[PDB]
Design a protein around this nucleic acid. Structure first.
Ligand SMILES: O=P(O)(O)O[C@H]1[C@@H](OP(=O)(O)O)[C@@H](OP(=O)(O)O)[C@@H](OP(=O)(O)O)[C@@H](OP(=O)(O)O)[C@H]1OP(=O)(O)O
Length: 67
RNA sequence: GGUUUCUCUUCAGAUCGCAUAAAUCUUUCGCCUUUUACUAAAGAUUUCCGUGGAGAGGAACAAUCUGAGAUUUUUUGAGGCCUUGCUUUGGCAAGGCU
């Protein structure tokens, strides 16, 4: 989130330079899109393992003593 | 001595990736009632998103294509001839010849 905020500042202070002002008209979404896809690369196996454990506890049942 | 595409197997020691996430363990910090979820540095490992080389099989298209392959100076007649020793009998070593 912090990286995205920093990127926005960078983009805005390369955008609002000449006659353009502080309007909401700047949409240059490639950098934040890159950041959230690299996050999604990292968060795919962790969420896969977590939801697999959730489904296995939902269907196989919870081991009482177990480990 | 074809291209394109799909799948499988094997090897990566190249910035395998002119990009970059996450997790585990051991310690140091910070926040701090306690536990997750946390802070950010190191080390040891992993997973994931991708990649390169080689081989094999399949499918669709061009059906070949791409190759490798002489006289006029200095590289051709200034060529033949008797004698002495050896003849090693194809001639060698020495003289005036043309
Ligand atoms: O720095 P942030 O906290 O991330 O807020 C910014 C900032 O607004 P603030 O100055 O008030 O903090 C920008 O403003 P500028 O200084 O660059 O002019 C910009 O606002 P502008 O559109 O007017 O440039 C942008 O706004 P937005 O993302 O809507 O485009 C956004 O403000 P927000 O946090 O409200 O979104």
């Amino acid at each position: 989130i912090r990286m995205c905020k920093d990127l926005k500042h960078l983009i805005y202070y390369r955008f609002n330079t000449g006659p353009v002002g502080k309007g909401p008209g700047c949409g240059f979404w490639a950098a934040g899109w890159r950041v959230w896809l690299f996050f999604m690369r990292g968060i795919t196996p962790l969420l896969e393992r977590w939801l697999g454990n959730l489904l296995a506890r939902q269907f196989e049942g919870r081991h009482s003593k177990g480990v």
